[PDB]
Amino acid sequence: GLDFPEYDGVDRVINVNAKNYKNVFKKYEVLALLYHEPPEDDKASQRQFEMEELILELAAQVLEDKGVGFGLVDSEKDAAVAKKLGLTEEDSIYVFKEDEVIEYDGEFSADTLVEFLLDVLEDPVELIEGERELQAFENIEDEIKLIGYFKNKDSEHYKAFKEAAEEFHPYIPFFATFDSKVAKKLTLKLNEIDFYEAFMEEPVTIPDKPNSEEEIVNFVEEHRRSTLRKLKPESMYETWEDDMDGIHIVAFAEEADPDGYEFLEILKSVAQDNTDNPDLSIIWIDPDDFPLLVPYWEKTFDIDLSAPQIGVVNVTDADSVWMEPSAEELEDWLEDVL
Amino acid sequence: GLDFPEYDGVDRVINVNAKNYKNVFKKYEVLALLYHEPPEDDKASQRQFEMEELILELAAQVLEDKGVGFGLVDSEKDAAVAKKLGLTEEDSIYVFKEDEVIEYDGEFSADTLVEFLLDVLEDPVELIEGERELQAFENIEDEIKLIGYFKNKDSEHYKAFKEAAEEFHPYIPFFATFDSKVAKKLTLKLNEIDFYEAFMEEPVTIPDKPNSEEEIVNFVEEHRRSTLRKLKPESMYETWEDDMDGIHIVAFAEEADPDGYEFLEILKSVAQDNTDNPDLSIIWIDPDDFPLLVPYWEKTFDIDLSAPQIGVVNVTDADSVWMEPSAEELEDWLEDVL
Prior knowledge:
Order of helices and strands of chain A: EHEHEHEEHEHEHEHEEHEHEHEHEEH
CATH class of the largest domain in chain A: Alpha Beta
Shape of chain A: globular
Number of strands of chain A: 15
Strand order of the largest sheet of chain A: 1-3-2-4-5
CATH architecture of the largest domain in chain A: 3-Layer(aba) Sandwich
Distance between the termini of chain A: 62 Å
Largest sheet of chain A: 5 strands, mixed
Strand content of chain A: 15-25%
Oligomer: homodimer
């Protein structure tokens, strides 16, 4: 009776250094690097480091037959490897998929890291050919998505789109179609790129068609903050550090709970009415995606996370106010505390 | 700008031994113990142990303000503490909620462990009072659930039900109602206990009413294997080791995918037609609940886990056959290979 697969105890995470680094880069397809401060002499410090290495050791085993290497570049001792690579953010992971660098903005857990890298392994523009890929695109809602329509893979404007997708890969989905039947369904004229905001049904089309790469990348950096964003594990620190000037409006709702989902609907209707407003960002957190954190959110905030919640929290003091409702009722309580 | 909470590096996991153990049991409400083989002298062995302790160290920090202690009882060196406690299964976790023992049958990850213990912390019979708790019960489908109706909390038969719930806590949900309005909705006559099989709509009622504890526990051990079971992380090894005589029929379906869910519907209809059959167990795995494992399932089994799949796998050789469909088509292909 054969069982499931466990951690074997074998070390696979590499000590990338001055001797090393050139050869680790040519041995792997995509390579993941924890650029890090050395372990400070005390126990607490070394156990936090003990942990990070062992989470990367798990990701290593799992992603071994797929060509993802993992490495540690020490900030003081491999300082020259850091300089010559573009390793500037201190205890963070950096991913090298064929020369160009992806920064990892999320959760330090073997779970989200492996999903991130699997997404990294994929092609940056995902194609639409026939209605079963179109009604896949149509259903994405929790993220910004762009879609474009071109002549074929050779179109000068599609190479522009595809290079813009690379700069946002894997975090923002870029789709393309060369079928005029999908373009008819989707509105699209030739070389038109429509941008869809997270949780919006209505798209803004990128203006001076046909768009160059720089034009598409200016557009997307200019429209990254959606009105309703979702705290996602692979992004969690990118969305948290984009506070609307010291403040965050945070809504907890379990999308699975009947009551959580109903509140999610109201909240989606609040964002759709004030999306013309730029200062706003409502961050929605589904407690269910962050199990280890909901006892922290429950005693800090002094809320029951079994219920849908809506608050405003001071991004610095961790200080907050929570509401004790309709869209218009949710709006008004937001007017009175802000 | 304050950030999220990290592992502090502080040790909280206890070395439970002959001197220790009596006093660790009176210091904590619920206590979790990894009974374990010592680390074998080599590196591979000690790194696998290095890991388990550090996963329990995370669960420890998280569940610190809730009263769950964590411990290590060595099988050779704390052999007498193991004997006198009922610690017989080798590298496994055992949970002591006020004297009576719960065995942990699942995934060794900080993620599922914390959810398990939070569920452990709850009361074993969950009450139904008014239609918003009834349409909560009505929606549970992936597990066996029992519901009973009594006079009030004092009813001799309810203390029987509640003691049966304790023996299955936290894995099988036991519900009770004292409201005759819910009992009318649910069918129930007084002190009637209805058993609902996983993914079945129709309940078997426990026979010689009113049921004693032993009668309710005989019933449930006799009806644990549902026709359609779900590989759940908190249970994964309990459901895998209940092979239907060397074999398992395993279906992959992403419940979120439009196509995965449609296959889930067909599969639910196959189980509902052959549930009168006892040898059958179809295990359904949603790949999305096991991210670290789907590259293993994809190259072993040589299947695309993006698609719904249905196979038969030899529980020992890991050898398998997979189908290249309607309920009747799914039945027939199951008749030809078995």
